């Protein structure tokens, strides 16, 4: 019960890189998506080792300059989303109407070390695809969060009008996709936290869509039906509050309904009743050791279920968003024995 929790560094990428999200394979290897300097998935094999192997899986340049979110669908298949971007600068806007969803298929004899990769669907009317979460009762379908600038442009960006946030469904078998939830301020930003997004990372648990909002401090959930639409009256519910810039989160370990969420240079745990504790990073004796965490996920091997693996994209604590020093990293946090 001593805080902060124990942590160690698995791997650093080079200056300028950005590790944006993470999915754990059934065999326990990590798959991480990068936004810069290119849009790729990397694998950390056997991440419980002191010095695990880190290998490029696939660079998605054929379709996109950057990847954002990743999520597992059916076992050992993954959906990533991405688009073209005006530049590799940390402040670069996306290029409107270039978003896409792609698949990495590790399932089956032929693919379990070299995956088969394909383009699933173009999303030219989306704004910025962000987080990906499979419907647990129908795992070939995912929800995808979507929010950022309505009018992204080449630098200097001057019109920062935000698009209203929304949630898509995507059928990875047929490629069919549509918006299933939109036009609710819980999905939106008004830049209370500076330039940012509204709805960011998503996860689905039982018949609830959960998400964090990077601008209003809230973790939300929404009751959904089996096609992903909201169950009337369709009103999001606050599950927790903390005045921090949320990015992504997970439930765990194992079957526990505790939320582990990345915040502003810090990691947080939130009880289902709304109690929020800072367990790593800024606000503990960790200080600035983990700048810019972006996502987290628990280990899946029989011998690391309590290890929370954390992706990040900064090499120093930023003074302001216009002076970011990008550097991708992955750390591992030992949550063994944590309780509220």
Ligand X SMILES: *[C@@H]1O[C@H](CO)[C@@H](O[C@@H]2O[C@H](CO)[C@@H](O[C@@H]3O[C@H](CO[C@H]4O[C@H](CO[C@H]5O[C@H](CO)[C@@H](O)[C@H](O)[C@@H]5O[C@H]5O[C@H](CO)[C@@H](O)[C@H](O)[C@@H]5O)[C@@H](O)[C@H](O[C@H]5O[C@H](CO)[C@@H](O)[C@H](O)[C@@H]5O)[C@@H]4O)[C@@H](O)[C@H](O)[C@@H]3O)[C@H](O)[C@H]2NC(C)=O)[C@H](O)[C@H]1NC(C)=O
Ligand Y SMILES: *[C@@H]1O[C@H](CO)[C@@H](O[C@@H]2O[C@H](CO)[C@@H](O)[C@H](O)[C@H]2NC(C)=O)[C@H](O)[C@H]1NC(C)=O
Instruction: Give the interface with ligand 80W as residue ranges (CB under 6 A).
Output: 20, 35, 66, 68, 94, 128, 148, 197
Check residue 90 for interaction with ligand Y (CB under 6 A): no
Instruction: Please provide the size of the chain in residues.
Output: 340
Check residue 62 for interaction with ligand Y (CB under 6 A): no
Using CB under 5 A, which of the segments 158-166, 245-253, 274-282, 327-335 binds Ca ion? 245-253
Give CA separation, 89 vs 35, 154, 157, 165, 338, in Å.
10, 11, 12, 24, 38
- What's the rounded Cα separation, in Å, for the pair 51 and 66? 27
Residue 66 contacts which entry, ligand X, ligand 80W, ligand 813, none (Cβ below 5-8 A, type-dependent): ligand 80W
**β strands within 16-99, DSSP E:** 18-24, 30-36, 40-45, 53-59, 66-72, 77-83
Give CA separation, 61 vs 18, 58, 102, 123, 126, in Å.
16, 9, 11, 17, 20
Check residue 264 for interaction with ligand 813 (CB under 6 A): yes
Phi, psi of 187 (to 5 degrees): -95, -5
Residue 252 CB, nearest approach to ligand 80W (Å): 23
Q: In the chain, what is the straight-line distance between the N-terminal and C-terminal CA atoms, in Å?
A: 9
Q: For residue 252, give both structure tokens.
A: 């765990």
Check residue 281 for interaction with ligand Y (CB under 6 A): no
Residue 197 contacts which entry, Ca ion, ligand 80W, ligand Y, none (Cβ below 5-8 A, type-dependent): ligand 80W
Query: Under rule CB under 6 A, which residues in 317-336 are in contact with ligand Y?
Result: 325
Q: For residue 178, give both structure tokens.
A: 């549509």
Given 236, 293, 299, 328, the residue binding ligand 813 (CB under 6 A):
293
Residues near ligand 813, by CB under 6 A: 91, 195-197, 214, 245, 247, 264-265, 291-293, 314, 318, 321
Residues near ligand Y, by CB under 6 A: 15, 315-316, 325
């Amino acid at each position: 019960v001593k805080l902060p929790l124990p942590q160690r560094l698995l791997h650093d990428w080079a200056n300028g890189s950005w590790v944006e999200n993470i999915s754990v394979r059934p065999n326990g290897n990590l798959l991480v998506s990068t936004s810069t300097p290119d849009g790729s998935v990397w694998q950390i094999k056997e991440p419980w080792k002191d010095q695990p192997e880190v290998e490029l899986v696939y660079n998605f340049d054929q379709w996109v300059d950057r990847l954002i979110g990743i999520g597992e669908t059916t076992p050992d298949k993954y959906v990533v989303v991405g688009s073209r971007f005006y530049s590799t600068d940390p402040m670069s806007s996306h290029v409107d109407r270039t978003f896409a969803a792609m698949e990495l298929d590790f399932s089956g004899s032929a693919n379990k070390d070299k995956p088969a990769v394909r383009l699933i669907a173009w999303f030219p009317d989306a704004h910025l695809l962000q987080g990906v979460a499979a419907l647990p009762w129908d795992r070939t379908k995912v929800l995808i969060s979507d929010q950022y600038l309505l009018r992204p442009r080449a630098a200097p960006q001057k019109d920062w009008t935000p698009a209203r946030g929304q949630v898509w469904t995507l059928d990875t078998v047929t490629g069919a996709h549509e918006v299933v939830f939109a036009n609710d301020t819980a999905l939106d930003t008004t830049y209370r936290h500076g330039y940012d997004v509204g709805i960011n990372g998503i996860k689905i648990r039982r018949d609830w869509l959960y998400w964090v909002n990077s601008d209003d401090g809230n973790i939300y959930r929404l009751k959904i039906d089996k096609t992903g639409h909201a169950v009337p009256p369709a009103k999001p519910e606050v599950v927790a509050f903390q005045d921090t810039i949320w990015d992504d989160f997970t439930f765990g370990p194992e079957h526990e309904d505790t939320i582990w969420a990345t915040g502003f240079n810090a990691i947080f745990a939130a009880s289902p009743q709304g109690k929020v504790v800072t367990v790593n990073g800024v606000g503990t004796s960790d200080n600035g050791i983990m700048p810019g965490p972006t996502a987290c996920a628990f280990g899946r091997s029989p011998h690391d279920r309590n290890i929370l693996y954390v992706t990040g994209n900064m090499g120093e604590i930023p003074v302001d968003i216009e002076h970011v020093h990008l550097k991708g990293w992955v750390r591992a946090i030992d949550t063994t024995g944590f309780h509220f």
